[PDB]
Design a protein around this ligand. Structure first.
Ligand SMILES: CCCCCCCCCCCCCCCCCC(=O)OC[C@H](COP(=O)(O)OCCN)OC(=O)CCCCCCCCCCCCCCCCC
Ligand SMILES: CCCCCCCCCCCCCCCCCC(=O)OC[C@H](COP(=O)(O)OCCN)OC(=O)CCCCCCCCCCCCCCCCC
Lengths: 317, 67
């Protein structure tokens, strides 16, 4: 019954991305002083099952001046890596016990930009031709802001597995000994996964969001779908790394209860940022990576190399 | 003879501009930060050092067998 476990994880998470689109706007609504979806629910709660069927009735045109084998291959690789990344992730037991899987996250988070380079090219012209080229350019630069300060906690964890990442935090809630790194951990995933203040991928008044701009609601229904699957997955990855919960072997039930409550709270922030702050005007977006984000990340890197040595506090492995 | 303006009852409301509430600034910050961070590393070396002791016990049970 291994095969019944995989389907027990793909299916209960497509609701949690469909019942986030509803909480996308109720939370964003009471900031504006207005109620949620009022009339169809009764409370709203039945909105996404009606708002899903309309997309698969509405005619999925392909553009006449488009290519063929590239345009319908990027949504295959969209939902592939958006759902494959949920595998090696402990809660409290992961589906797969990888020896080194923290690196496997970057082995999965690297190839997502290789679909945007397809879809911006595969269909058509300037509102997604050059307008998606400068969306690959922001997402590549926020790995070296990411991969360094992901390594900067592993000097204190001890190894590459994720079971040690819960063992080392039984008494600490490790956001305290590394709170400068925890800041730039947030803004990276806030800009890499293409969200509200550092936007130009989706597109406000930029490429009039020319990375979708062309998908009718047949193939478009996943892009949004798949994408919303990253944003609840960097939140499930931050809360297993910094704000780690407590594991008890005799009681694994109380792990998940105290766990899903925490990833939901960080997921609120991606909604709660959007209702405050304006955009970044593509220069100043990348003007603060090199000049401003990056030299501090090397500074704490050299700090976290020497401090396990000159404390005589080497983590065991 | 039924016309508006009252004989009295007025404010007015201000034209002013003020909300400068401070705020715990100016060497109060950078002092709670370092004082919190050094409590973190002090909470290290009591766990990472202690886990290093149980680590050797885990290798110990290996070596006492395997002849
Ligand atoms: C459009 C449809 C057509 C395309 C359909 C196919 C699409 C497939 C794309 C999937 C890409 C995922 C590739 C990821 C490779 C990384 C896998 C990995 O590293 O697993 C971790 C583990 C490492 O070993 P370890 O951790 O030490 O095991 C514990 C031992 N105590 O390793 C293991 O546990 C076992 C290692 C051997 C397992 C078999 C080999 C894994 C790769 C098989 C697929 C080959 C890749 C196909 C090409 C990819 C294209 C993107
Ligand atoms: C000797 C002992 C050792 C000493 C250790 C001391 C530790 C010190 C730790 C310091 C390092 C951590 C702080 C990180 C640096 C902050 C990033 C930065 O430098 O931003 C600079 C940015 C540039 O703009 P600026 O310079 O202000 O010029 C324009 C003025 N007209 O100006 C900005 O402010 C930009 C602000 C961020 C831009 C994105 C804002 C979007 C919203 C993000 C909200 C995030 C909220 C928190 C994240 C979640 C936290 C859990």
């Amino acid at each position: 019954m291994f095969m019944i476990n995989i389907l027990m994880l793909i299916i209960p998470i497509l609701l949690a991305v469909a019942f986030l689109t509803l909480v996308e706007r109720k939370v964003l609504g009471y900031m504006q002083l207005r109620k949620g979806p009022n009339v169809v629910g009764p409370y709203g709660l039945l909105q996404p099952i009606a708002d899903a069927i309309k997309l698969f009735i509405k005619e999925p045109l392909r553009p006449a001046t488009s290519s063929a084998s590239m345009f319908i291959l990027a949504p295959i690789m969209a939902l592939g890596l958006a759902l494959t990344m949920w595998i090696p992730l402990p809660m409290p037991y992961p589906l797969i016990n990888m020896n080194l899987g923290v690196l496997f996250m970057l082995a999965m988070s690297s190839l997502a930009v290789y679909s945007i380079l397809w879809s911006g090219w595969a269909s058509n012209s300037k509102y997604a031709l050059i307008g998606a080229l400068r969306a690959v350019a922001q997402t590549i630069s926020y790995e070296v802001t990411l991969a360094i300060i992901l390594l900067s906690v592993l000097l204190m964890s001890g190894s590459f597995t994720l079971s040690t990442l819960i063992t080392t935090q039984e008494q600490m809630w490790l956001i305290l000994p590394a709170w400068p790194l925890a800041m730039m951990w947030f803004i990276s995933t806030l800009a890499e996964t293409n969200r509200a203040p550092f936007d130009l991928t989706e597109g406000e008044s930029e490429l009039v969001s020319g990375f979708n701009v062309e998908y009718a609601a047949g193939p478009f229904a996943l892009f949004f779908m798949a994408e919303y699957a990253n944003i609840i997955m960097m939140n499930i990855f931050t809360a297993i790394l910094f704000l780690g919960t407590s594991h008890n072997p005799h009681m694994p039930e109380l792990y998940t209860i105290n766990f899903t409550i925490k990833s939901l709270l960080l997921t609120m922030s991606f909604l709660w940022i959007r209702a405050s702050y304006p955009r970044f005007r593509y220069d100043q977006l990348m003007h603060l990576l090199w000049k401003n984000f990056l030299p501090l990340t090397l500074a704490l890197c050299m700090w976290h190399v020497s401090l396990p040595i000159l404390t005589s506090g080497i983590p065991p492995q | 003879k039924q016309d508006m303006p009252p004989v009295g009852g007025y404010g007015p409301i201000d034209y002013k501009r003020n909300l400068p509430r401070r705020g715990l600034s100016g060497y109060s910050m950078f002092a709670v930060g370092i004082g919190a961070l050094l409590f973190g590393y002090w909470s290290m070396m009591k766990w990472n050092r202690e886990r290093r002791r149980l680590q050797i016990e885990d290798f110990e049970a290996r070596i006492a067998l395997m002849p």
